[PDB]
Amino acid sequence: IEEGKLVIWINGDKGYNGLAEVGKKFEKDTGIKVTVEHPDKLEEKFPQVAATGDGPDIIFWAHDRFGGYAQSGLLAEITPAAAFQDKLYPFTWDAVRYNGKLIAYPIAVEALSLIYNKDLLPNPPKTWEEIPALDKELKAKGKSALMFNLQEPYFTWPLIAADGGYAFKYAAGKYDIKDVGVDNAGAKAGLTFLVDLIKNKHMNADTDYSIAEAAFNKGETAMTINGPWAWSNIDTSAVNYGVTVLPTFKGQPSKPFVGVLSAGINAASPNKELAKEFLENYLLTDEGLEAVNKDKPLGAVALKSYEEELAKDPRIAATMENAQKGEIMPNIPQMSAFWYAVRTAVINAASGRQTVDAALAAAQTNAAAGGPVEILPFLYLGSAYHASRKDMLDALGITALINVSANCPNHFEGHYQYKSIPVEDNHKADISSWFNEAIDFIDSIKNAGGRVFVHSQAGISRSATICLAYLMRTNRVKLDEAFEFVKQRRSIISPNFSFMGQLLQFESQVLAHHHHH
Amino acid sequence: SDLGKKLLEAAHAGQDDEVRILMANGADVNAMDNFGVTPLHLAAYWGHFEIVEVLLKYGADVNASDATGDTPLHLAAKWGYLGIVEVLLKYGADVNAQDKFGKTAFDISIDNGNEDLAEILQKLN
């Protein structure tokens, strides 16, 4: 960075020019230049440049990414006074707590709401259960009741969590990374209702974000589910719309995820005291947030005094009400496993590829413990434990297994095609003489439209070796490139030294004639 | 397969003649999508009496349960479709079949306010 100046990164979908305007007032009062940038994919650029010791002094992002930044020591701890904290709602400070330390200033509160077309539906439904009957009426007039993104679990979570689902359990100031709540009775009930909506044709499993927004903004559907970032496009569409509390399910509030847009101070910044003065005395004021909100709406805000003004707008009152009934997104790194696990579960349940129970059972284990890893779209790697979990194999679309062991059972014959490679995990086993047969089996399943799960006992030596051999042969790459590729995706792989020898010998066999092209 | 998918769509959409054409050309009247939903399920849910009739005439399973436990009688009872319910029963629909919540068609009709149909179902065992 650079001393005596402040550099701020904030996403391009935010009021960055209102923020820049607050910086100019700071510069006018102090002489301290403030520069606001909005790089593409800044949430990925930040961890790279900040580990160097560069990047912005201040980064704005939803609080959930900030736990990962704080794990890598990329964010400075802040210690605002109790008199300052009391200016903000207590739950927003909770969202920026990591390992007992505050690591950002809360700014705004973001939650999904029910957006409805007042001309098609002057009185929006209080419950999810009445939406099928509403869709019957509207279909009779060439419209539909409800379209929203079914591809991303962020958007289906409010229904799934309503009756008791949750991501990670919080207790005693800490998330329990092994207590996931995606396969409890409440989550099953919510996803079961979502599947009923789809299988009965009230919604289409292929509706994504763009499809739902276009249909609502063209007056084709009476309702959507979306956040404050979408209001501008609706404003342009001139649809006469309202924003309200989400429907209940079994009488329980829908429980959307809550994101707190937050301002973290780079641990490498030489301007930490300046950043704190800017954030506490300039941004987190009625006038500062008003300047940002004018540019692009923040939704609800963390500052009590300004939230009370903004809440006169019912769209913002509704955002805050849905947030009160929601669940703060856990800020722990294990959430990346959660998002992938639950994304797969919802897509599989919405397409009928898995039952609700099996989809959520697989996602539960994936999020709380681990699971088989994708190597290529048709090739997956894991353990004998995974080979006993039909729900976890089905979740990946597995149609065939290579059992690379002498002892491990085949649990599901007649559901999957099995291939046996009977070798031991030791220095005497000749695994390379099975390479061609394994590769031919993988390609055979691949070209029939299937997917292969390769496993051993631990999924770290015999099965990893077969996957490495497949990659080297199919892509004409060296051991070191394939190994790094697989290690990146299943970090515990560790082929025994004899297998590594046999793979290096295979490498010179695969590439012996490659230098001519 | 291909025709089965078109028959499912036409049964949902209420396209009488398309249903008949697809059936004449070999569409499985017991076709299933990934939810185990059949054309008779969709015709009953969406209120297409004539499509329900022709499907049953040519061998649609009146007691098929989809992957979630719903029978066609369950789906018709949700909306109080008395004509459809009557022809389902005539073809042997089981009034006592239970969905995934343990509810019969009678319970389902009350749960959606169709108590005129509940009164008729109550006299049946």
Residue numbers in the entry:
A (entry chain A): 3 to 519
B (entry chain B): 12 to 136
Question: What does the paper behind this entry write?
Answer:
Dual-specificity phosphatase 1 (DUSP1), also known as MAP kinase phosphatase 1 (MKP-1), is composed of a kinase-binding domain (KBD) and a catalytic domain (CD). To investigate whether these MBP-specific DARPins can also help to promote the crystallization of MBP fusion proteins, we tested the two MBP-specific DARPins off7 and mbp3_16 (DARPin 16) in concert with MBP fused to cata­lytically inactive DUSP1 CD (Cys258Ser). For the first time, we have demonstrated that high-affinity MBP-binding DARPins can be employed to facilitate the crystallization of an MBP fusion protein. The DUSP fold is virtually identical in all of the structures of the DUSP1 CD, indicating that the presence of MBP and the MBP-binding proteins did not distort its structure.
The maltose-free or ‘open’ form of the MBP-DUSP1 CD fusion protein was crystallized in complex with DARPin off7, while both the maltose-free and maltose-bound or ‘closed’ forms of the fusion protein were crystallized in complex with DARPin 16, yielding a total of three different crystal structures. The crystals of the DARPin 16 complexes contain one heterodimer per asymmetric unit in both crystal forms, whereas the crystals of MBP-DUSP1 CD in complex with DARPin off7 contain two heterodimers per asymmetric unit that are related by twofold noncrystallographic symmetry. DARPin off7 has three (N3C) and DARPin 16 has two (N2C) designed ankyrin repeats inserted between the same N- and C-terminal capping repeats. Although DARPin off7 has previously been crystallized in complex with MBP, until now no information has been available on how DARPin 16 binds to this target. The structure of MBP-DUSP1 CD in complex with DARPin 16 reveals for the first time how this DARPin interacts with MBP. Surprisingly, even though the amino acids in the designed regions of DARPin 16 and off7 appear to be dissimilar when their sequences are aligned, the two molecules bind to the same site on MBP and adopt remarkably similar poses. A structural alignment of the two DARPin–MBP complexes reveals six conserved residues that emanate from different locations in the amino-acid sequences of the DARPins yet occupy the same spatial positions at the interface with MBP. Hence, this binding paratope, which is primarily hydrophobic in nature, was obtained in two separate directed evolution experiments with DARPin scaffolds having two and three designed repeats, respectively. On the other hand, in the crystal structures of the MBP-DUSP1 CD in complex with DARPin 16, helix α1 residues are occluded by a crystal contact with a neighboring molecule, rendering these crystal forms less advantageous for crystallographic fragment screening.
